[PDB]
Amino acid sequence: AAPNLAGAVEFSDVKTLLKEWITTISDPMEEDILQVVRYCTDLIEEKDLEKLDLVIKYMKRLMQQSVESVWNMAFDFILDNVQVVLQQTYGSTLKVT
């Protein structure tokens, strides 16, 4: 099975799904955070760094617009984990600006 978050394969559906998650939920669950990390990890393993970047970039925009402190930290946590995987897989970290 191709990398998916909660069943959503196409980036269109992932966007909608993540948009709902961040805006609707006020305090994210740890399991949801980990599924997002797991998903990002799977993009790397299946050699789809384009979509990874698209996903990271989108989450950054929404989680940093969020006045909810917890989302700001949630993005940092997600990105830290992704960077570890990239460090071991490629010996480099993702350029994020």
> Is 74 exposed, middle or buried, given 0-12, 13-18 or 19+ CB atoms closer than 10 A?
buried
Q: Which residues pair with 8 in a beta bridge?
A: 5
Joined together, the tokens standing for residue 75 give 């993005």
For residue 46, give the H/E element and its range. Answer: none
Solved how?
A: X-ray
Q: How many CB atoms lie within 10 A of CB 40?
A: 24
Q: Are 38 and 78 in contact (CB under 8 A)?
A: no
Amino acid symbol at 67? V
Joined together, the tokens standing for residue 91 give 């010996």
Its sign, for the CA torsion 3, 73, 95, 19, is: positive
- Homologous superfamily of the 1-97 domain (CATH): DNA repair protein Rev1, C-terminal domain (1.20.58.1280)
Q: Which residues pair with 5 in a beta bridge?
A: 8
Q: Are 22 and 71 in contact (CB under 8 A)?
A: yes
Measured CA angle at 51 (ends 59, 6), to 5 deg: 65
Measured CA angle at 75 (ends 2, 19), to 5 deg: 65
